[PDB]
Design a binder for this molecule. Structure first.
Ligand code: DCO
Ligand code: DCO
Ligand code: ASP
Ligand code: ASP
Ligand code: MN
Ligand code: MN
Lengths: 874, 874
């Protein structure tokens, strides 16, 4: 059924193989073949070749390491490429097929309890906001997204019979240059990327995929609405918005200073003028019609009656080149009086464009208006002047420490030592105060100053540049009020969404109480304007108590918050962190969104997309359209057909599973005193912090979530994503409640979704490679622990399969199952090679010798490649 | 066999029809349908509807004229579009199929007398230079070539089964906007275009088609050479060059002044930096490799060792932006000291690019070098700094008058009254003189000054900007020497190709004597460096004595010149004017090139492409590749397998046909005193001069060739292209020499080619529409002449068919036959409508009333549309 896929992968492999024979001989190709074959033979049980593989690897000279690593990495990359094409291909999976949306609409029409009026309102309340986050393992000096768009185009064109002989020969010639380019044009980062680089990477995603993707999705959305429901959404209604954390998230990242943020903000505005300039140039050429409505004829008046439309567009172009010119000056550190037509508000762009639209529509030229004009008009509300808004995120602790320094300096006392009650008292008092609190000439510590300057950047940036201020480690009501106070002493002249981030088991359990108390403060209710945003940190919570407990805690917290706000008349918007079932993408994501507590999506969908997944969710415009469509279908269905409330007996099983699984999980991660040492040997955890990967960088409770998950993904154990789940399920089965579990799996989405996430993690895990790493990097004294963790997975897989009444992992998702099988095959060699690299690297620093550049770079290629093949592992 | 074509035309017609129903109701659509049906019924003989058609037309209100005309014009345009796609389509005619070239190469290999060595040298001597000329009937305010490229892309994509439902729906949506745009975005020129506008039009052809077309053709050429002959041409060998007359040809065009030429020259340089800038930007991104040859490492040295290639390309970009900046200043009339890295020679661009190429090739990266780099490298030699070189053309008379004014002022005497001998004496004396002749402070007449300033522009422009100086109406040796003298007194610091243009029957007969005398002047031989260029003006010669005589005279002149130069060791390059069998394009052109006198193409191919045909020969990159390939195949075959020498008896028949046909032709065009009045009534000759068509504008001997041919093409008689040919053939048949004629047709290419050209002209002619014009615009007293000219064609068609032993016109060319049939159908209504427009227009000016703007613009649409449907008619 996937013959086209197998073929394409085989054809690309040849082109790459030939490109390698030219560059640096065929010796490298022989090595890649030997390692590939030996590795496969070792997995089959041939212990003779296992030794042969080991020897083969130790004999690779440092001069071969890089070429070899790149070979495997390239084959994987072409495999991924072929896979992505097969997904959006009509003859393949047809991911960008508008049918995905129609299927949902039709389902809703056949529902008796649903009246067209209640459905029409659900569509009008649609709201999606995707927040781009940095890519943790981007090793290339420059972004190569545009190239992949071209390789895809070649595949789309070649995917056709009745194709001319000389035409096919021409496409192949181009494809050969494209591959060759990737092999010779590879600049591994020598240094760690700066926030500004990560920000630019995000800009590349916008123009190469989102720019076309959003308008195309909106185009299809309306078309399906009218065809199935009988009406389109108003032109002014654009339910999609893109935001970013690059340059805004400074949580545990000292490199993101107030200046970097200020810089990134100008840079975004600049890029926005660059992209809108191209759009406007088109309109200035096409919109030449003469006939226009009286009103429009006014805005242009004299000198503009000859070409009314062409007129306004040229003033817009002059306007744009003006601001762009100014920005380029400010970006170079040059101060200069801001021009007249400086653009700072999307309204300034929308006004003239919308006018032209209105006119053309009236004077009988809708086909034109709803063409390129409608696209630019939508890009204005989705991207606008700032291009992509950004959130600011800092930990509660930093705010507390800065305030404590401020109070001690003024002689008021020590904020850091006051009880929660006293803090609230102090904050409410100063929030209502008209007398300033912040000293004019103050020389605070470095950290405190950064907290103060960041807030100054927020107050200076045009309104609409910053979307929200997120508070990591939020625990108490004062954590939320503190930030509102600093923003006040900064000169903020408008409402700023401040969202608490509960990223701990305890904090999630208290989340509802914390919000109840906040909403009881009359003053605070009048500040939020009936709108509150809360962030759920699933990844960090899972790292704290295990995925089982984490999941159940998240469900209860959301459900409580939904009701607490509903009752208080506050519109609650849940902000989802990275990972989890919601961050799986594709069909599973569509399902995970529906399995949330009733009302979870009434406040719209807002999720932070993980960097390592951007390519697979928004890599190409077609993929972008697919993703947004899946989300849209999920939101509508979840708001009209919410999941059933769980039976009292189910909640009791979840409470027990939560406790048992948390116990097992912390039993190893915390109690077991041989874990940490084992962890640092079996995984490349230590090198993830040292190598130049990403901007931001003790014990396990000191490590960040991403590194936690990534480390266990490199050695293929995936521990963080299953460690205690199966063991707790096993226990409940021994109590004869297996039938209760099976029932939950069938009738309670939350539960079926949790088991599904587990099935996928097991599908990517590789117990054989995990054992391989132990025998190469772990001390024989620690092998017992490793073998114990592996047997644990084997047992968990059986229990999970039994409760799902299946014979093999994720049989409900044949396509994804296949895709995974394909990627595991091409990823395999990188793992086998990485063990050797980690061994040499660790032998050098242990010998005192200096780190070998070749060994280090080769390591980066595997880390980045393995991550690219594994995708979402948590 | 042409079902795909019929379908596409029908599908586009619908989309246009629907687009019309929205814009301005369906009344217009009903009119278009009524006129279409009535016209067809009148042609069938229904005299009842003929009156109905007449009435229908007189009832059209002036407010309907424009919309209606545009409707017919649009349908024709879509018909042409469909036709062009069908030509380059693989399932269609596959015009851009590399097979066109391979077929020729294989033919040459199977030839015993041809040794691979003599063939290899023929390929190395390959030389094509295409000279773009203005489009005589371009009524749009802006160029719309880029749009047609997109409409074609939509057709290519839709031309595929296994195409997704939602994919087809998406392509159709785009196609509908494209059509709608053409219907609402139509700005008819209010004023006559300036030379600068025509020049910009030429630039649009370069970037939208030639820029990609040339490199693609060169790519295919080499690939076929190696595959069939076993070798590719050296990278430095680029046998194609593009030149233009826009801004250079001032023959009978007072609007092309020395300033316009100076301006157009800067503008070209400017555009060249714009296009090369884009090319360089790519290389600056892709060429990032580090490994480079020692030599290249030198050119970059320190600070350039990190990124050698990326280095040179950035200096090139700085270089380009520098000159571009300067040009923009000079273009605004602002003087400023020229920068340092100012580019003025192609060598400056080729140097760095070629170096990078050399390196990449050595360090094992040929796949990269022969990619985008090879393309830009070829665009350098084909276009270069000036983008497109230009020729200067002025009539001999102007040179004579300026020199006579100069000599009278100096008291030397009167050049204008000296015999040919005295002129030669004077010119040779002053050409060898070291004492200047031109006064420092002289106030000559306007005309003389223009002649002097133009030469000053040539001397100031960077060397390589002007390709040749053509002399219209060349008659004597002194005409050639005169120009060389003026260029000398101008400060010209290099060799400048000066080509005589023989555009008269007498001048063509004397051409050889004139050149023999020139080559006998030892001084003149040392000036031309063994290279001489001569221009043949077939169009003007045909207008002088008829196509038959013209053709025979051209053949004899070329043959004589070839031998005269061969004997004198001079390399002769024949420059072909517009029209004729050589300007037919496609297969006929390939044939016409081969039917030329042996040696005609040893000096390379240089022809001026007619404006009205640029779209059909270079409209799309694929069409460009097709055209250049046909030319290439023709040149090689003609230089290795020349046509057979004609039998003495054949030359005698041609001498007689020449005389008889010239007699008949001048019998009407000159002797008949009722011709001129009839001519001014039956054709829109008078309005072609008055309407704002083209830059350049008595009796018939005062009218220009283009207008001569165009006028008779609008009323569908095509008189200029056949008037005396058939009558002379008829006479020779009455002498029982029909068998001699039939023999010539079979064994002498020149002759079969001449008859073929006639068959095509008759295929486009429409005797029914020609009669329609007479009954609407010609005085009943002149009808006898008209009916006589029509019967003449009827008789000529029979004779031509008999000598070709065929039943229908051009049965040897089924595709072109079909294409013509299709175009005649969509052109038909424009002719029927134009008669009414011409009638109203002529009734107003005859009534004294002012010209109605609506009537005039509608007329322009028909003139331009009819010309677009008829294409090459002379
Ligand atoms: O829940 C969280 O802690 C996280 C992960 P981070 O603190 O490593 O960014 C998110 Cl993204 Cl919400
Ligand atoms: O032979 C000629 O006279 C012509 C036609 P023109 O004098 O109308 O440009 C050419 Cl192009 Cl060569
Ligand atoms: N994204 C898939 C897994 C994968 O393709 O790697 C899932 O979450 O189920
Ligand atoms: N170009 C064709 C005629 C035409 O297509 O109009 C020919 O010269 O034979
Ligand atoms: Mn966190
Ligand atoms: Mn002429």
């Amino acid at each position: 059924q996937y013959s086209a896929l197998r073929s394409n992968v085989s054809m690309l492999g040849k082109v790459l193989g030939e490109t390698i024979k030219d560059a640096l001989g065929e010796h490298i190709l022989e090595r890649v073949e030997t390692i590939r074959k030996l590795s496969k033979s070792s997995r089959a049980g041939n212990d003779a070749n296992r030794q042969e593989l080991l020897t083969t690897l130790q004999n690779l000279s440092n001069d071969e390491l890089l070429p070899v690593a790149r070979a495997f990495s390239q084959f994987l990359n072409l495999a991924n490429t072929a896979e992505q094409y097969h997904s959006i291909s009509p003859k393949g999976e047809a991911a960008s097929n508008p049918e995905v949306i129609a299927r949902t609409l039709r389902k809703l029409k056949n529902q008796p309890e649903l009246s067209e009026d209640t459905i029409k309102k659900a569509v009008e309340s649609l709201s999606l906001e995707l927040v781009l986050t940095a890519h943790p393992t981007e090793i290339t000096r420059r972004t190569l997204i545009h190239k992949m768009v071209e390789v895809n185009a070649c595949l789309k064109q070649l995917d056709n019979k009745d194709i001319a002989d000389y035409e096919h020969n021409q496409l192949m010639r181009r494809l050969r240059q494209l591959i060759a380019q990737s092999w010779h044009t590879d600049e591994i980062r020598k240094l760690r990327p700066s926030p500004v680089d990560e920000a630019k990477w995000g800009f590349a995603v916008v123009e190469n995929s989102l720019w076309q993707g959003v308008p195309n999705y909106l185009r299809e959305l309306n078309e399906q609405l009218e065809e199935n429901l009988g009406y389109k959404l108003p032109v002014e209604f654009v339910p999609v918005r893109f935001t970013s954390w690059m340059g805004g998230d400074r949580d545990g990242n000292p490199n993101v200073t107030a200046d970097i943020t200020r810089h990134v903000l100008l840079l975004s505005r600049w890029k926005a003028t660059d992209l809108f300039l191209k759009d406007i140039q088109v309109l200035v050429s096409e919109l030449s019609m003469v006939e226009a409505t009286p009103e429009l004829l006014a805005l242009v008046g004299e000198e503009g009656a000859a070409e009314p439309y062409r007129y306004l567009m040229k003033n817009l172009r002059s306007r744009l080149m003006a601001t762009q010119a100014w920005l380029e000056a400010r970006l170079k550190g040059e101060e200069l009086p801001k021009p007249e037509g400086l653009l700072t508000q999307n309204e300034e762009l929308w006004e003239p464009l919308y006018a032209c639209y209105q006119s053309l529509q009236a004077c009988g030229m809708g086909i034109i208006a709803n063409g390129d004009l409608l696209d630019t008009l939508r890009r204005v509300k989705c991207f606008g002047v700032p291009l992509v808004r950004i959130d600011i995120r800092q930990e509660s602790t930093r705010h507390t420490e800065a305030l404590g320094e401020l109070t001690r300096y003024l002689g008021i006392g020590d904020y850091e030592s006051w009880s929660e009650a006293d803090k609230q008292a102090f904050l409410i008092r100063e929030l209502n105060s008209k007398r300033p609190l912040l000293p004019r000439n103050w020389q605070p510590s470095a950290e405190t100053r950064e907290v103060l300057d960041t807030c100054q950047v927020i107050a200076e940036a045009p309104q609409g540049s910053i979307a929200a201020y997120v508070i990591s480690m939020a625990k108490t009501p004062s954590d939320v009020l503190a930030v509102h106070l600093l923003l006040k002493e900064a000169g903020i002249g408008f409402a700023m969404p401040v969202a608490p981030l509960f990223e701990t088991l305890d904090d999630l359990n208290n989340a509802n109480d914390v919000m109840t108390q906040l909403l009881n403060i009359d003053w605070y209710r009048g500040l939020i304007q009936g709108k509150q945003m809360v962030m759920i940190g699933y990844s960090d919570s899972a790292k704290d108590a295990g995925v089982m407990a984490a999941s159940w805690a998240q469900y209860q917290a959301q459900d409580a918050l939904i009701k607490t706000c509903e009752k208080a008349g506050i519109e609650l918007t849940l902000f989802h962190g990275r990972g989890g079932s919601i961050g799986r993408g594709g069909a599973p994501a569509h399902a995970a969104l529906l399995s949330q507590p009733p009302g979870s999506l009434k406040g719209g969908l807002r999720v932070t997309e993980q960097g390592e997944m951007i390519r697979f969710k928004y890599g190409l415009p077609e993929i972008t359209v697919s993703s947004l469509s899946l989300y849209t279908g999920a939101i509508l269905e979840a708001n009209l057909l919410p999941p059933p409330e769980p039976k009292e007996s189910w909640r009791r099983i979840m409470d027990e599973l939560s406790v048992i699984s948390c116990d097992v999980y912390r039993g190893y991660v915390r109690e077991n005193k041989d874990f940490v040492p084992y962890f640092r040997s079996a995984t490349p955890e230590q090198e993830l912090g040292k190598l130049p990967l990403g901007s931001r960088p003790g014990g396990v409770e000191s490590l960040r979530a991403i590194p936690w998950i990534f480390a266990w993904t490199q050695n293929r154990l995936m521990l963080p994503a299953w460690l205690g789940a199966g063991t707790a399920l096993q226990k409940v089965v021994e109590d004869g409640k297996q039938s209760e579990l099976e029932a939950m799996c069938r009738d309670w989405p939350f539960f079926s979704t949790r088991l599904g996430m587990l099935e996928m993690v097991f599908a990517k895990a590789d117990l054989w490679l995990a054992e391989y790493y132990d025998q190469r990097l772990v001390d024989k004294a620690l092998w017992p622990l490793g073998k114990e963790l592996r047997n644990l997975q084997e047992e968990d897989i059986k229990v999970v399969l039994a409760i799902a009444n299946d014979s093999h992992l994720m049989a409900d998702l044949p396509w994804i199952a296949e895709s995974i099988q394909l990627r595991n095959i091409y990823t395999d060699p990188l793992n086998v090679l990485q063990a050797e690299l980690l061994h040499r690297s660790r032998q050098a620093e242990k010998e005192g010798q200096e780190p070998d550049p070749r060994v280090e770079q080769a390591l980066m290629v595997t880390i980045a490649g393995i991550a690219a093949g594994m995708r979402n592992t948590g």
